[PDB]
């Protein structure tokens, strides 16, 4: 029973980063070689594990988080980073155990006139904790005047659209990102390599 990685990486549609998707992966054999032999990824790095050893390891829980961000924001999907993605949308732990995988999706996620379906959070009263998700749409109080859900001066709707356009430079183009987290919790293993 092979793990449903084709579902995660080859899905027609990806989530916005503020509403990033989580898929639990369990009770299956994980052929990471379909990934670590492929040459389609612009980013493929792991923390606490080596990419060539994943086929020899067993884990209690495996989660696949996926979303779309700009190419020049992929750097923020790393331990210790700051910026609107790391602070307000998707936060990796400082001691992250897992892998970060990304690839250019300009051919799929850009549109003439701009694809406005992909959103990110621009304002928040505090930084996200690791693996936290915030899907609220409350008006952000940037000044001394309470907003009371009314959008206006100093009172901002907290989400903004990327507006991906196909003629953008590579840094401004959309990138699809999958974060694999490998969890050990003193229980039997559910996900193992093809051994």
């Amino acid at each position, epitope marked *: 029973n092979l793990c449903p990685f084709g579902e995660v990486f080859n899905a027609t549609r990806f989530a916005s980063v503020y509403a990033w998707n989580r898929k639990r992966i369990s009770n299956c054999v994980a052929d990471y070689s379909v990934l670590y032999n492929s040459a389609s990824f612009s980013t*493929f*790095k792991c*923390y606490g594990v080596s990419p060539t050893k994943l086929n020899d390891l067993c884990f209690t829980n495996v989660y696949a988080d996926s979303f779309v961000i700009r190419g020049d924001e992929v*750097r923020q999907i790393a*331990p*210790g980073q*700051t910026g609107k993605i790391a602070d307000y949308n998707y936060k990796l732990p400082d*001691d992250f*155990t897992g892998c970060v995988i990304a690839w250019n999706s300009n051919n799929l996620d850009s549109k003439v006139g701009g694809n406005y379906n992909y959103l990110y959070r621009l304002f928040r009263k505090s930084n996200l904790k690791p693996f936290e998700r915030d899907i609220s749409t409350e008006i952000y109080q940037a000044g001394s005047t309470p907003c009371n859900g009314v959008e206006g001066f100093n009172c901002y709707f907290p989400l903004q659209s990327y507006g991906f356009q196909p003629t953008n430079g590579v840094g401004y183009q959309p990138y699809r990102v999958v974060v694999l987290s490998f969890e050990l919790l003193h229980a039997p293993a559910t996900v193992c390599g093809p051994k």
Partner: nanobody
Amino acid sequence: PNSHVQLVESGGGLVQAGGSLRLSCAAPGRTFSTSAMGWFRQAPGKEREFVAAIDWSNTNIHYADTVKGRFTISTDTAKNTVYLQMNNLKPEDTAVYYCAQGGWGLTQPISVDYWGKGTQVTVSS
């Protein structure tokens, strides 16, 4: 220069060929204990090249072929410092040596997240 993660190298200097020298890199290993630590070097007119890599558990050690049997990478137990012990130094080892923190890459040993400032090593014949 403004990131929370900062890496500071020290120990560079002038050494005679055949001598030894140990570089140090202060690093936030207690906090970022799962990241890969590595050393790079860049000589004048050449591209930066990989030298060595290690995790904070003193395992998963990688070496470039040019330094195998001469260089040794290691960490301290409190996860505060990475080291590059250099033995039987040659003139070709002259370069600015950089410390780096990142993740274990698929196409290369380390996909770097953070860079140090570098320390100058000069080997004279």
